[PDB]
Structures are given as C-alpha cells and as structure tokens.
Design a protein around this ligand. Structure first.
Ligand SMILES: *[C@@H]1O[C@H](CO)[C@@H](O[C@@H]2O[C@H](CO)[C@@H](O[C@@H]3O[C@H](CO[C@H]4O[C@H](CO[C@H]5O[C@H](CO)[C@@H](O)[C@H](O)[C@@H]5O)[C@@H](O)[C@H](O[C@H]5O[C@H](CO)[C@@H](O)[C@H](O)[C@@H]5O)[C@@H]4O)[C@@H](O)[C@H](O[C@H]4O[C@H](CO)[C@@H](O)[C@H](O)[C@@H]4O)[C@@H]3O)[C@H](O)[C@H]2NC(C)=O)[C@H](O)[C@H]1NC(C)=O
Ligand SMILES: *[C@@H]1O[C@H](CO)[C@@H](O[C@@H]2O[C@H](CO)[C@@H](O[C@@H]3O[C@H](CO[C@H]4O[C@H](CO)[C@@H](O)[C@H](O)[C@@H]4O)[C@@H](O)[C@H](O[C@H]4O[C@H](CO)[C@@H](O)[C@H](O)[C@@H]4O)[C@@H]3O)[C@H](O)[C@H]2NC(C)=O)[C@H](O)[C@H]1NC(C)=O
Ligand code: HEM
Ligand SMILES: CCCCCCCCCCCCCC(=O)O
Ligand SMILES: [Mg+2]
Length: 335
C-alpha cells in the first residue's frame, strides 16, 4: 500500500579519503533484470554493490552510496537525487530506477507520471553528453564508443593525454556544437543547461583518485573503466573532501553559452531562451521543476499526495542551500 519516506541522510561522519574499491564491494557482471542507465557514477556504485546491484534504490540509498563511494557532497546529492526521484521515481514505493522502466519499482503511478527511471528524456536527462548520445539518435543511455573517442581526442589535444579542466571547457562546447549541427530536436535549457556543466567536472573532482592532491587529471584507462565498464579503478580511493561541481564556472567561462535549443525542427538553428534558468538565475530551475511535477501529478490524494509533499520538501532543503535561497512552493499544501 506504500512507504513512509524518511528525510535524506546528512553528510558522512568520516569525510576523508578511503579505499572504496574494497573486498566488500567487488565489481560483478550484470544479471538478468539488472538496470543500468545514463549515469556512470550510479552505474559504478550499483556494479560494486554500494547500491542494490539491480539498479533500483531508495533516495536515501542513493544519497548514502554517492557519499560513501565518491564523497559526493551532501547537498549536491540531495539536489540530484530528489530531482531524479520526483520526476522519474515511484513516490509511493520510494524506489527509483537508475535506468529504464522496470517492475522492480512496483505498481505504476497514475499517468502522466511514469516512474520510468533516469533514462526518461526531456526534463532531467538531456543532450550533448560526453559518453552518451542524444535521445534523438535512438539511445540516450548506452555508452557510445565514438563519443568516448572524442573524449580521448580532446584529452590528447588539450590535456596532455589526460582529462583536466582545460579539456572539459573545450569538450563541453564542442559537444554543444555537434548537437546543434546534427540534432534538429536539440534542447539545452532549464535543468539540462545547469547539469551539463557540473557533469563535465565530476570526472575531475570525483573520478580522480583522492590521493592525488595536485594537478588533478583523469587517465583514459580510468575513464574507460568507469564510463564504459562501470568499474572503479584498481585500489580506487575516493576524493579526500566532499566534492561536486567545483570548476564548472570555469568550464562555462572558457566558452560562454546561453540556454536555448534548435527551433522549428531544424539543425544549425539555435535560438536563446531568455526565460530559462542559468547560473545567475538558479531559482528558475526550482520553479520549473515544481511546475513539471504538477504536470506529472495534477490531482494526487492519499499516500501519493503525502509522499509528494515530503519529497518536495526534502528537495527544497537541498535546493535552498545549493542555490543560495529559494522561496519554498507548496503546490499540494501541507501535511
Ligand atoms: C591540462 O593539461 C594541459 C597539458 O598538460 C596543461 O597545459 C599546460 O598549461 C600550462 C599553463 O597552465 C603551460 O605552462 C605555461 O606555458 C605558457 C606558454 O608557453 C610558451 O610561451 C612561453 C613564453 O615565451 C616568451 O618568450 C619567447 C622567446 O623565447 C617569445 O617568442 C614569446 O612571444 C614569449 O614572449 C615559453 O616560455 C614556452 O616555451 C618554453 O617551454 C617549452 C616547453 O613547453 C619549451 O619548448 C621552450 O623551449 C621554452 O622552454 C612556450 O613556448 C607560459 O607562458 C607559461 O609561463 C608562465 O608561468 C611560468 C611558470 O609558472 C613563468 O615562468 C612565466 O613567467 C609565466 O608567467 C607557462 O609555462 C604548459 O606549457 C601546458 N603544457 C602543455 C603540455 O600543454 C593545462 O594547464 C592543464 N589544465 C589544468 C587546469 O590543469
Ligand atoms: C554514437 O554517437 C554518435 C555521435 O553522436 C552517433 O553518430 C552520429 O549520428 C548522427 C545520426 O546518424 C549523425 O547525424 C547526421 O549528420 C549528418 C552530417 O554529418 C557530417 O557532419 C558532422 C559534423 O557536423 C561529422 O561529424 C560527420 O562525420 C559528417 O561529416 C547530417 O547531414 C544529418 O542530418 C540529416 O538528418 C537530420 C535528421 O532528420 C536533419 O535534421 C538534417 O537536415 C539532415 O537531412 C545528421 O544530423 C552524426 O553526424 C553522427 N556523428 C558522428 C560523429 O558520427 C552514432 O549514431 C552513435 N551510435 C552508437 C550506436 O554508438
Ligand atoms: C546523486 C544522484 C545522481 C543522479 C540522480 C544522477 C543522475 C544523472 C543523470 C540523469 C545523468 C544523465 C545526464 C543527461 O543525459 O542529461 C547523469 C550523468 C552523469 N553523472 Fe550522474 N547522477 C548522480 C550522481 C552522480 C555522481 C556521484 C557522479 C560522479 C561520481 C555522477 C557523474 C555523472 C557524470 C560524469 C555524468 C555524465 C555522463 C556522460 O555525459 O557521459 N553522477 N547523472
Ligand atoms: C548529475 C548529477 C547532478 C544533477 C543535479 C544538479 C542540479 C544543480 C547543480 C548545481 C548548480 C549550482 C548549485 C551549486 O553550485 O551549489
Ligand atoms: Mg543525455
């Protein structure tokens, strides 16, 4: 009949480096029914058993796994997790697929809500990723070797054969240009505009071994291991401090860019969207997503309403800090 969802975990008691690829968290191959998706972080945590190996988890499990496995900073974890859960999870069973649809999330919600997982395109998952292709081309979730070859090429050209912040700036812009030129449905606004800059520094801040204190750069071997194989590097130690999107501002500054998309189902036709969230208007992202949730859940009652109210509040607790203060919205009132 349903779960009563607990508030998110706080930061871990211990926030230093440690071995995370350890005997208790072995890489294992996929079994029948195991779900993986567009996030290499969550994929790796699932494939090492930091998350349930089937790739379906509670918000609380995701937050603790990202903290334990990578030292993802607590508020960043809260912002990402409840965004994903509100839009793509089952609020009654409190389960989120890190990939596509699965009976493992339990009885479906009332449409147009779907609990279809992180693979669902258009409000969270979006275009111009590093190792995943745009949904327009037919597969937004699988590793794409051609795109990884470009990652390697840009690492050779700008990072001495490694991925570093200079490479991130160049690759992000070039990937936007690829999508402008080839994807007539290309969108780069609202949630995606914000998440696309953070995702380009996560490999530097979180995939580079935490024992490396200076000149942080990711080898192509380690990159392939995580992005393709969902496997921690041998002897991997997590970041020595909680971390998330440090340096994302510099990635944007290297090639200033404005939220928008290709208009009128045509390539090379990018039009700015002045109403979109951007990095000096972050609260628009909060308002936009609350609106999206109302479209998914036009008139909830009972346990569904209760769990929506709670999850919206949990998300706001992270957003309020991460975005430097946003007025909380109450689309369904209070408990
Ligand atoms: C991601 O990874 C990449 C790749 O690893 C990494 O790139 C390195 O980035 C750093 C900067 O962040 C680079 O280091 C800097 O290089 C600057 C450019 O150097 C060129 O020009 C120099 C200046 O020349 C003057 O004099 C000549 C006359 O001889 C004249 O023609 C010019 O017009 C000019 O006036 C020159 O010195 C330099 O050449 C030397 O070094 C090369 C070897 O690279 C050698 O072949 C030459 O014979 C010569 O010894 C080169 O041609 C440079 O200006 C800059 O200098 C500043 O800092 C140093 C010390 O910090 C001070 O001494 C100096 O006063 C300056 O203030 C600095 O050295 C580095 O070269 C990149 N490496 C590679 C391989 O690309 C990114 O940083 C990474 N990103 C992150 C975020 O980590
Ligand atoms: C892995 O990921 C890669 C990279 O995203 C996918 O490859 C891309 O696939 C798409 C779809 O086939 C390609 O898009 C098409 O590109 C044509 C132009 O290509 C040239 O120009 C680019 C640079 O701008 C070069 O990189 C490329 O090598 C070519 O020289 C366009 O003409 C096409 O447009 C036509 O169709 C659209 C859609 O209907 C219309 O809007 C247009 O008006 C037009 O008629 C189209 O956009 C894209 O070029 C591919 N990129 C690369 C680098 O290969 C893989 O499919 C994917 N595969 C898997 C399974 O891993
Ligand atoms: C906390 C919960 C998390 C959620 C809900 C989440 C969700 C997502 C989603 C939906 C994408 C696809 C983005 C898109 O196509 O637009 C993505 C990409 C990504 N995530 Fe996660 N993520 C989380 C945590 C993490 C962590 C901890 C890391 C790093 C350790 C990470 C690293 C990445 C990277 C690098 C990408 C880009 C992949 C690519 O472009 O090739 N994420 N994530
Ligand atoms: C891929 C996981 C992250 C997705 C969720 C990120 C949404 C907001 C990112 C941070 C934007 C600025 C906030 C900050 O700097 O603290
Ligand atoms: Mg994507």
């Amino acid at each position: 009949q349903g779960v009563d969802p607990p508030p998110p975990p706080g930061p871990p008691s211990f926030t230093g480096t440690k071995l995370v690829n350890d005997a208790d968290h072995p890489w294992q191959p996929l079994r029948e029914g195991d779900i993986r998706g567009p996030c290499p972080g969550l994929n790796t945590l699932a494939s090492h058993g930091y998350l349930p190996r089937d790739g379906v988890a509670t918000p609380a499990q995701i937050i603790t796994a990202t903290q334990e496995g990578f030292n993802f900073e607590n508020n960043a974890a809260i912002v990402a997790t409840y965004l994903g859960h509100l839009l793509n999870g089952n609020l009654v069973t409190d389960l989120l697929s890190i990939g596509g649809a699965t009976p493992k999330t339990g009885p479906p919600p009332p449409p147009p809500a779907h609990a279809g997982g992180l693979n669902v395109h258009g409000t969270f998952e979006g275009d111009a990723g590093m190792t995943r292709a745009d949904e327009f081309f037919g597969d937004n979730h699988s590793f794409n070797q051609t795109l990884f070859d470009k990652f390697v090429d840009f690492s050779n050209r700008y990072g001495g054969g490694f991925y570093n912040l200079t490479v991130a700036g160049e690759l992000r812009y070039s990937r936007i240009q690829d999508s402008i030129a080839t994807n007539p449905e290309f969108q780069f606004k609202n949630v995606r505009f914000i998440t696309a800059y953070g995702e380009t520094v996560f490999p530097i801040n979180l995939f580079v071994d935490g024992r490396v204190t200076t000149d942080r750069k990711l080898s192509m071997e380690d990159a392939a291991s995580i992005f393709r194989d969902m496997r921690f590097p041998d002897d991997f130690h997590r970041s020595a401090v909680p971390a998330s999107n440090e340096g994302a501002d510099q990635v944007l500054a290297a090639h200033p860019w404005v939220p928008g998309g290709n208009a009128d189902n045509q390539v090379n036709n990018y039009v700015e969207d002045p109403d979109s969230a951007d990095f000096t208007h972050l609260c628009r992202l909060y308002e936009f997503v609350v609106g999206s949730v109302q479209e998914l859940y036009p008139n909830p009652t009972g346990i569904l309403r209760r769990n929506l109210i709670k999850n919206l509040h949990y998300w706001w607790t992270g957003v309020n800090v991460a975005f430097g203060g946003c007025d909380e919205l109450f689309p369904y009132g209070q408990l």
